[PDB]
Write a protein that binds this ligand. Structure first.
Ligand SMILES: Nc1ncnc2c1ncn2[C@@H]1O[C@H](COP(=O)(O)OP(=O)(O)OP(O)(O)=S)[C@@H](O)[C@H]1O
Lengths: 53, 54, 152, 240, 230, 239
């Protein structure tokens, strides 16, 4: 739970192209406003899968 | 009026697909964009993989 | 290479006043042939922005001597070349353009109030292309804020 | 890790582990390098005596396929002997059917197809060899090729086959290779082989040097290394 | 984990590697073929994967002689092989007898070939089910074969995806007595029952067999006919 | 699934075989990209080279293989399969020229190569030569052609063609690019090839890495470009 550390910058390694923006939409924006999705009526973005290397 | 059969879970996924796809553009309702984006995103192209032996 | 900006700028310091207007387009292929290089990551970048500073010294010619910024179609033609010939992956010499276009809105903010709003609004419709190609990274979108403020 | 049994089967990610295992079979073999100059190709093989049981003049990996072509093999020795015989046979067919010397590109392509044909089927294993091929011609210059265990055959200026494959070509490439005649390149190869592994894991090694170019007038033979003795009087000056 | 390979019977059932090839046939592209009173109509379903592909290179409906049509439902790389075999074999018959080979004799010999590949034990079967037709001696015919070496005789049938659904439409829609055009109409009907939504002059590919000979229709007449045929 | 461990070429349940669909990414271990384009009376191949070494040569890294005097090709996948496939192609074109008296059309060659791959696939105990082959050629009464040959033996052939590593993306660009009905005036073809590889890989590099093979109905001979004219086209498409 709360052993969870954090990074000393947003750019702890790099490559923040889709990262900042799409992670920003999938978390922070409907938590700021659910009524925008309540123009449709659905829960917030159901979450990506960080796969690859 | 379309064929290319789409089931009920697939229909609801198209509707929520399109609604989220317009509200993430900070809009009110889809102006027929994201319905056709939901078609050309959701079908979702018979896989890729393999187009040999059919 | 670290020699081209040296030779061009440092030996063409004279060629803005003694020349009428010719070395602008006669440094245009010079600017493109250095713009297709990114070797030292700040030498070509800073020296090309110094050639763009000499270009802004010729902006006095382009907006005062000759017709009022009618040559900006040629200017955003050479910047069209320089911004879509060597795509850069948004890098490698690109941050010469921040000071360049902040200098452009500096020039236009000092040109807007006397003559008319035509050269500044043609500059805004050029830089709408340049900066909708560009990003929300530094003040050029705050320049978009103040420029749509100017169109208001 | 599989699925590594046959040379016909594929993997879940798409490669043949037999060919990979044969590629790293040659990794344990002795270090053998080669380099060309502007008028010839020089070979050189780090060859080691077992303990004291050899005769200094047996089983020389520098073969001699055609009148102007020889090999610089490294890997399993008997398999390389068989492959050298196959290459002699192919140059024999070309000389018998067309009346002139085999071009090195065509020879290398036939040999690569032969190696590939031993990599294809399941009855046979891939070769455990990796060798060098040099030539010289008056209308063609110097040509140096290179054949892996899989069968990929293309050309180099310099190469190395053995343990110190990287550790030779790190300082092979700092040679000004074009402007030198091969008589300099002889002591160059001498110093390169002498750099790697003087005494650390093994006790003693011994040098062989093959030699083809314009100076041999199109012939290919081993150097008279005892003549001009260019390694050791410079190898002892290469430790400092 | 059995059967494995092709040489031994099951404990009680059948030859699982033939069953899997039949399943691989049933997992293939759909097709329909109808025997009418005067002619036989064949029709396939040929979708390009992308918008890049050309529709003039590969051909599904394929003649074996000037009066014998032949389609499949499976894999082209085996289809072409057994097509070539049937070509050479039919020309051997025409060398011997100086007479165009009857379709039953084609189906006999092709079935012998396919059976010989189903024989033991290193080669796999074809993943191809044929639909052979022709107008021999007045009465036209229609012959389905299979990877197992067997063969049949149909009035109308289908093979590929939803062959069961297309067959239940064929049993309802078709009958014994029609003409060739009505056969094409019900054939494009039963292919339009099951195909994808964009069916054009190129996604289908239709050849007929008059008593005057085999005929492979063009996209010109296919677009004229399928310009909202119903 | 499997289960059957896909060791030999048999039929698995439901219903596919796994050997060929493992062979389809033996191309992907090549680390290489190929793009073909047919617009008009010309046809253009573009393919890069991955040379990390200065000791390695540059002439013999060419993947464009002139099969016959009017037919070029390009190969991807592993190199040994590709070269053996190339000598079979050359041999069979020469067999055509011996038997039938005239130059082989590019269609029959693709058919024959696919059939050889099917025989290597139908009968077991031989590896099915896991390389993909793209052909080009000029034909009378048909103009130019571009074809693709599969390791499975599935040939087809069409206007804008791409195979290698990253060609789902390349075919995405070629659907997003061959949809507008403009003509293709040969430098449009060269420009679209250079820029499609330049947008898929996003490198925008020297003229010394890609190889360009063209054929045109003005010189039906197969033709490999030089560094100078590749550089000329590359700065000619630089806007
Ligand atoms: N008639 C229908 N009208 C509207 N939406 C439907 C209809 N039928 C199904 N759906 C949608 O599809 C979903 C069907 O329930 P599911 O959760 O998909 O059942 P399921 O458990 O996931 O499938 P199985 O076979 O039970 S595992 C519903 O939650 C709706 O979103």
């Amino acid at each position: 739970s709360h052993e969870d550390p954090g990074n000393v910058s947003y750019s702890e390694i790099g490559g923040l192209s889709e990262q900042i923006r799409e992670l920003r939409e999938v978390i922070e924006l409907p938590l700021t406003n659910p009524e925008l999705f309540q123009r449709v009526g659905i829960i917030p973005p159901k979450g990506c899968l960080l796969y690859g290397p | 009026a379309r064929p290319d059969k789409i089931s009920g879970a697939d229909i609801n996924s198209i509707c929520q697909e399109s609604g989220m796809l317009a509200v993430r553009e900070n809009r009110y309702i889809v102006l027929a964009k994201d319905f056709e984006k939901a078609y050309k995103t959701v079908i979702k192209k018979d896989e890729q993989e393999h187009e040999f032996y059919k | 290479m670290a020699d081209g900006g040296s030779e061009r700028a440092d030996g063409r310091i004279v060629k803005m006043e003694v020349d009428y207007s010719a070395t602008v387009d006669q440094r245009l292929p010079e600017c493109a042939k250095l713009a297709k290089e990114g070797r030292l990551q700040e030498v070509i970048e800073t020296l090309l922005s110094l050639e763009k500073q000499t270009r802004t010294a010729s902006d006095m010619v382009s907006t005062s001597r000759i017709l009022v910024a009618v040559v900006k179609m040629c200017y955003e033609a050479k910047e069209w070349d320089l911004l879509n010939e060597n795509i850069m992956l948004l890098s490698k010499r690109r941050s010469q353009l921040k000071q360049a276009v902040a200098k452009m809105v500096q020039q236009c903010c000092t040109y807007v109030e006397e003559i008319t709003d035509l050269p500044i609004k043609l500059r805004l419709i050029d830089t709408l292309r340049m900066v909708t190609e560009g990003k929300i990274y530094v003040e050029i979108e705050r320049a978009r804020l103040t420029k749509t403020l100017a169109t208001i | 890790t599989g699925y590594d049994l046959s040379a016909s089967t594929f993997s879940p990610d798409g490669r043949v582990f037999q060919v990979e295992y044969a590629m790293k079979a040659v990794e344990n073999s002795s270090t053998a390098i080669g380099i060309r100059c502007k008028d010839g190709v020089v070979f050189g093989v780090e060859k080691l005596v077992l303990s004291k049981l050899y005769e200094e003049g047996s089983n020389k990996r520098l073969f001699n396929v055609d009148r102007h072509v020889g090999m610089a093999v490294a890997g399993l020795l008997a398999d390389a002997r068989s492959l050298a015989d196959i290459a002699r046979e192919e140059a024999s067919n070309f000389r018998s059917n067309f009346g002139y010397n085999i071009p090195l590109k065509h020879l290398a392509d036939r040999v690569a197809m032969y190696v590939h044909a031993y990599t294809l089927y399941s009855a046979v294993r891939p070769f455990g060899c990796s060798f060098m091929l040099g030539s010289y011609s008056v209308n063609d210059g110097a040509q140096l090729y290179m054949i892996d265990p899989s069968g990929v055959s293309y050309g180099y200026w310099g190469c190395a086959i053995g343990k110190a494959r990287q550790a030779a070509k790190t300082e092979i490439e700092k040679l000004q290779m074009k402007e030198m005649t091969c008589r300099d390149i002889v002591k160059e190869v001498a110093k390169i082989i002498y750099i790697v592994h003087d005494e650390v894991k093994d006790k003693a090694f011994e040098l062989e040097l093959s030699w083809v170019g314009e100076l041999t007038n199109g012939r290919h033979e081993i150097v008279p290394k005892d003549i001009r003795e260019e390694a050791e009087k410079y190898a002892k000056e290469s430790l400092k | 984990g059995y059967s494995f390979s092709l040489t031994t019977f099951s404990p009680s059932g059948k030859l699982v590697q033939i069953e899997y090839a039949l399943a691989a046939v049933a997992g293939g592209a759909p097709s329909v073929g109808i025997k009418a009173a005067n002619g036989v109509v064949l029709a396939t379903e040929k979708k390009q994967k992308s918008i890049l592909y050309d529709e003039r290179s590969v051909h599904k409906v394929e003649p074996i002689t000037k009066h014998i049509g032949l389609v499949y439902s499976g894999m082209g790389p085996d289809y072409r092989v057994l097509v070539h075999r049937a070509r050479k074999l039919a020309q051997q018959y025409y060398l011997v007898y100086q007479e165009p080979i009857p379709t039953a004799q084609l189906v006999q010999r092709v079935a012998s070939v396919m059976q010989e590949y189903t024989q033991s034990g290193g080669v796999r079967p074809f993943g191809v089910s044929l639909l052979i037709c022709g107008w021999n001696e007045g009465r036209p015919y229609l012959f389905q074969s299979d990877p197992s070496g067997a063969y049949f005789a149909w009035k109308a049938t289908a093979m590929g995806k939803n062959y069961v659904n297309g067959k239940t439409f064929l049993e309802k829609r078709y009958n014994e007595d029609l003409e060739l055009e009505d056969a094409i109409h019900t054939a494009i009907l039963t292919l339009k029952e099951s195909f994808e939504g964009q069916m054009t002059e190129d996604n289908i590919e239709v050849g007929i067999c008059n008593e005057a000979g085999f005929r492979r229709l063009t996209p010109t007449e296919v677009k004229d006919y399928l310009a909202a045929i119903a | 699934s499997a289960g059957f461990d896909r060791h030999i070429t048999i039929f698995s349940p439901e219903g596919r075989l796994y050997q060929v669909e493992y062979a389809f990414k033996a191309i992907n271990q090549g680390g290489l990209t190929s793009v073909a384009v047919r617009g008009k009376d010309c046809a253009v191949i573009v393919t890069q080279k991955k040379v990390p070494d200065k000791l390695l040569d540059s002439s013999t890294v060419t993947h464009l293989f002139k099969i016959t005097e009017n037919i070029g090709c390009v190969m991807t996948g592993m190199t040994a399969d590709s070269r053996s496939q190339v000598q079979r192609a050359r041999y069979e074109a020469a067999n055509w020229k011996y038997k039938y008296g005239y130059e082989i059309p590019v269609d029959m060659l693709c058919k024959r190569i696919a059939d050889i791959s099917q025989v290597y696939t139908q009968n077991a105990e031989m590896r099915p030569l896991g390389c993909c082959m793209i052909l080009i050629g000029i034909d009378e009464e048909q103009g130019p052609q571009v074809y693709k040959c599969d390791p499975a033996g599935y040939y087809c052939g069409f206007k804008a063609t791409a195979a290698g590593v990253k060609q789902t993306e390349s075919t995405s660009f070629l659907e997003k690019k061959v949809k507008k009905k403009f003509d293709w005036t040969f430098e449009q073809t060269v420009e679209t090839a250079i820029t499609c590889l330049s947008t898929v890989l996003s490198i925008d590099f020297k003229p010394s890495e890609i190889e360009v093979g063209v054929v045109t109905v003005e010189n039906p001979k197969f033709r490999i470009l030089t560094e100078a004219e590749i550089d000329a086209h590359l700065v000619a498409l630089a806007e």
